[PDB]
Write a protein that binds this ligand. Sequence first.
Ligand SMILES: CC(=O)N[C@@H]1[C@@H](O)[C@H](O[C@@H]2O[C@H](CO)[C@@H](O[C@@H]3O[C@H](CO)[C@@H](O)[C@H](O)[C@H]3NC(C)=O)[C@H](O)[C@H]2NC(C)=O)[C@@H](CO)O[C@H]1O
Length: 129
Amino acid sequence: KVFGRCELAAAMKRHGLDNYRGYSLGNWVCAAKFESNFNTQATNRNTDGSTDYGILQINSRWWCNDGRTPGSRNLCNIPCSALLSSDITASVNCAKKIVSDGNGMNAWVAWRNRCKGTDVQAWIRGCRL
Ligand SMILES: CC(=O)N[C@@H]1[C@@H](O)[C@H](O[C@@H]2O[C@H](CO)[C@@H](O[C@@H]3O[C@H](CO)[C@@H](O)[C@H](O)[C@H]3NC(C)=O)[C@H](O)[C@H]2NC(C)=O)[C@@H](CO)O[C@H]1O
């Protein structure tokens, strides 16, 4: 599923992300935009053999099991495939775990380089929230 900007904003808001660990809604929407272009089915393979999955491009070496990443942790205790669903519940619950680990949203490369220090508030412009 390819989410609309406002649509996603609303879905994240209802799932508890507006201001989760001090990160405003604009941050999450912006991160999703640059990570997967709002596509829940997005996948990307990395040099270390791990793969990034879904709307938040969650990594298989740390957060989910895809049965193909060698010496992997499955911190969210979930098959990576579960993160490619139209229902973002899995992704958001995993994200909550990630953002609370110590590097905050810096865990999202796209976020660090294209969202951090920008006016993320623009991402929720015109939304009915
Ligand atoms: C969205 C996504 O998957 N992004 C990937 C990042 O998760 C990943 O970064 C690494 O995250 C792990 C777990 O949060 C970092 O580990 C922990 O670091 C904290 C303090 O920084 C410490 O308290 C924990 O002991 C330690 N956990 C373990 C089990 O070691 C790790 O430092 C992050 N890596 C770096 C270089 O900062 C990166 C890298 O695989 O990929 C993103 O795609």
